[PDB]
């Protein structure tokens, strides 16, 4: 029972840390993915635009 209580507490704390690390990674990956999307490519020259208007 002592091993059960201490393994459970460790698991809960280890799970919070893993989620925090995973979320931060996902957030960084989303920023990188979005930055690639916003990167201008040469094909974009063939897309008609009316930026001024």
């Amino acid at each position: 029972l002592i091993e059960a209580f201490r393994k459970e507490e460790a698991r809960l704390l280890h799970k919070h840390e893993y989620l925090q690390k995973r979320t931060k990674e996902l957030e960084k990956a989303k920023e990188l993915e979005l930055e690639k999307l916003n990167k201008e490519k040469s094909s974009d020259l063939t897309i008609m635009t009316l930026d001024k208007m």
């Binding site: 040469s42 020259l45 063939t46 008609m48 930026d51 001024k52």
Partner: protein, 217 residues
């Protein structure tokens, strides 16, 4: 926010390039040349573009009064020689792209076509002139040379008194201005079309397409 120097638009299967510097008579700077050079490479790869149409938004006042050499002069006075060499690498590279372009390019020389403007049309087999056309190469008065491959084109396209490049030398060394019908008869213009008919022609150019299994090239 500011009006783009060169405007690109779709005309059915034709891609219209319009020079948009009316206050400068459509003078060509490094920005304009770079934009046109890059967009033409994309259109060359595209399989939906059959031809390109190079016109101005200032017609009949001017098509292109020439490369922006006044800015290149300031660079020389400021020793900004890197800036000057960028201006000529872009312009001359665009003139080389137009000359070797595999798809038809149709230039509407509806107005003053002097200097860089000549480079935009002289290298296209479809260079249309109008009553408002004013072709000239006034470089001898500014201390420069006949640029934009005019020393390769004029000696090969002029029609009269050009057996030994005599007429080509006359236009390049005297800076004589040729107007409308005369430009067509000398070989400076491939076709002579009234300015009023340019709208209709543009629409017809967008509507025609290669038949069956023939590419636009």
């Amino acid at each position: 926010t500011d009006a783009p120097p060169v405007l690109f638009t779709v005309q059915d299967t034709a891609r219209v390039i319009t020079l948009n510097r009316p206050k400068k008579l459509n003078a060509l700077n490094a920005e304009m040349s770079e934009s046109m050079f890059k967009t033409l490479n994309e259109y060359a790869k595209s399989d939906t573009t059959n031809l390109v149409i190079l016109k101005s938004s200032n017609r009949p006042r001017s098509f292109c009064a020439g490369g922006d050499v006044a800015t290149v002069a300031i660079f020389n006075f400021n020793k900004e020689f890197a800036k000057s060499i960028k201006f000529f690498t872009d312009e001359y590279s665009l003139n080389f792209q137009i000359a070797t372009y595999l798809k038809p390019i149709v230039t509407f020389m509806d107005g003053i076509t002097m200097g860089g403007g000549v480079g935009l049309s002289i290298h296209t087999p479809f260079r249309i002139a109008t009553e408002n056309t004013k072709w000239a190469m006034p470089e001898m008065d500014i201390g420069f040379f006949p640029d934009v491959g005019s020393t390769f084109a004029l000696p090969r396209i002029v029609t009269l008194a050009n057996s030994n490049s005599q007429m080509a030398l006359y236009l390049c060394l005297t800076g004589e201005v040729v107007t409308g019908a005369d430009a067509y008869m000398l070989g400076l213009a491939s076709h002579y079309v009234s300015s009023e008919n340019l709208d209709a022609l543009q629409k017809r150019l967008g509507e025609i397409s290669p038949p069956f299994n023939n590419d636009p090239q």
